[PDB]
Paper text:
The Drosophila peptidoglycan recognition protein SA ([name]) is critically involved in sensing bacterial infection and activating the Toll signaling pathway, which induces the expression of specific antimicrobial peptide genes. [name] is a secreted protein circulating in the hemolymph (the insect blood) of Drosophila. Members of the [name] family are expressed as either secreted, cytosolic, or transmembrane forms, which all share a conserved 165-amino acid domain (the [name] domain) with an evolutionary connection to bacteriophage T7 lysozyme. Contrary to the general belief that [name] has lost enzyme function and serves primarily for PG sensing, we found that it possesses an intrinsic L,D-carboxypeptidase activity for diaminopimelic acid-type tetrapeptide PG fragments but not lysine-type PG fragments, and that Ser158 and His42 may participate in the hydrolytic activity.
Author numbering: 11 to 179
Amino acid sequence: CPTIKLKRQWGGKPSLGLHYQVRPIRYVVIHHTVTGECSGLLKCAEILQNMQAYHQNELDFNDISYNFLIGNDGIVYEGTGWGLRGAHTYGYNAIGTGIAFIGNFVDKLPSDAALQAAKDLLACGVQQGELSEDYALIAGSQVISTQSPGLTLYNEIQEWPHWLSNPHH
């Protein structure tokens, strides 16, 4: 079970509005940030802080759009966190957990540590009752008009158990 970097622990601002999710959650949506990569708290916190500010100020979201975000270091950074609605995926915020790999993975994969942290996050979520034992894992590109999480990353995750090939758009 990965130790999650909580919101305060990376210097993030409190959410401007809470919307509680049903438990358990049935969909996990995978994204990339279309940002540079990062490792370690110092560079990861800068990106997340700027991203949250952009989401709250320019995009009018209550908080950083993703539920969780994962760095090259293989640490899971709390975005909206478990049980709270983000704004990462149209039609899948209330009923989904949005997980973004930090970086751009059209042409490359995230680090092995990032990929393993993600699998651990999903298994622990099932174990803790955060996710349905038969949760569906999907790419953002399956359900909204986007390339996220990037073709290469997309090719990776369609091989994990729980991948669902036909989620509703």
